[PDB]
């Protein structure tokens, strides 16, 4: 019995999300995760969706100036909650997401949550600050007929469940 | 250290 069991039974089971993880608000790094897939399938790699140790990317600005940036993925989650913007976007598992929206103290059936949403090609993610100094990360994949709104409700339901514990 | 999962 672990966080995996809990994430799987309470959230992955909804079929509304392609993956879900929990990160500490201390560093924004995912410490537990689950993903849709046929474990095992020798070859599913849930962690590649949720984690990548620091890496440099090359960036070119509109002046054609090329620089190199070190991405710390955890910091890109924290910056959105801490500052209300993402200077470099939100990066998770080596994938860049566009920061689309944040709501603070969004009310969901008697419980209030800070919720951020980010988008990528045919999918996206939600970040929800949840009890016990944690951040929930939920992924959705529009190729799977999951959607932005339904995945958010799934995440919110799970968060409420946590709050209720 | 991660927290313990909630009871089922
Ligand atoms: Mg930038």
The sign one gets for the Cα dihedral A100, A24, A36, A109 is negative
Distance CA A130, CA A147 (A): 22
CB atoms within 10 A of CB A67: 10
CA B4 – CA A1 distance, rounded (Å): 10
Residue A54 CA, ligand 1 centroid: distance in Å:
16
Cβ distance of A165 and B8 shorter than 8 Å: no
Q: Is the peptide bond before A40 cis (omega within 30 degrees of 0)?
A: yes
A1 and B8 within 8 Å at the Cβ level: the answer is: yes
Q: Report the alpha-carbon distance of residue A100 to residue A135 in Å, rounded.
A: 17
Q: How far apart are CA A10 and CA A4, in angstroms?
A: 10
Cα A139 to chain centroid distance, Å, stands at 6
CATH architecture designation of domain A1-165? 2-Layer Sandwich (3.30)
Min distance A61 CA to chain B CA atoms (Å): 39
> A19 near A50, Cβ under 8 Å?
yes
Comparing alpha-carbon positions, the chain B residue that sits nearest to A1 is B5
Q: Is A20 helix (H, G, I), strand (E, B) or coil?
A: strand
A88 alpha carbon to ligand 1 midpoint, in Å?
4
- A52 vs A47: CA distance, rounded Å: 8
Q: Would you give the end-to-end CA distance of chain A in angstroms?
A: 17
Q: Is the Cβ–Cβ distance between A20 and A7 less than 8 Å?
A: yes
- Provide the 10 A C-beta neighbour count for residue A139: 27
Q: Contact B5/A31, CB-based, under 8 Å? A: no
CB contact under 8 A, A22 and B2: yes
Q: Which of A82, A108, A86 is nearest to A97 (CA)?
A: A86
**What's chain B's Rg over C-alpha atoms?**
7
* Residues in B touching A162 (Cβ below 8 Å): 6
State residue A117 phi and psi, 5-degree precision: -125, 140
In Å, how far are A34, A82, A87, A120, A165 from A29, measured between CA atoms? 15, 15, 18, 20, 23
């Amino acid at each position: 019995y672990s966080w995996d069991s809990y994430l799987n039974d309470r959230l992955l089971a909804t079929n509304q999300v392609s993956g879900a993880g929990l990160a500490s608000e201390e560093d924004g790094v995912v410490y537990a995760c689950v993903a849709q897939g046929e474990e095992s399938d020798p070859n599913f790699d849930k962690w590649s969706l949720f984690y990548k140790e620091d890496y440099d990317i090359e960036v070119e600005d509109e002046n054609g100036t090329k620089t190199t940036k070190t991405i710390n993925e955890g910091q890109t989650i924290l910056v959105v909650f801490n500052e209300g913007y993402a200077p470099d976007g939100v990066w998770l598992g080596g994938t860049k997401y566009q920061f689309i929206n944040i709501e603070r103290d969004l009310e969901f059936e008697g419980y209030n949550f800070d919720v951020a949403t980010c988008a990528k090609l045919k999918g996206g993610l939600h970040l929800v600050k949840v009890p016990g100094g944690n951040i929930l990360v939920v992924l959705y994949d529009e190729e799977k007929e999951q959607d932005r709104g339904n995945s958010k409700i799934a995440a919110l339901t799970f968060a409420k469940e946590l709050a209720e514990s | 250290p991660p927290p313990p999962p909630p009871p089922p």
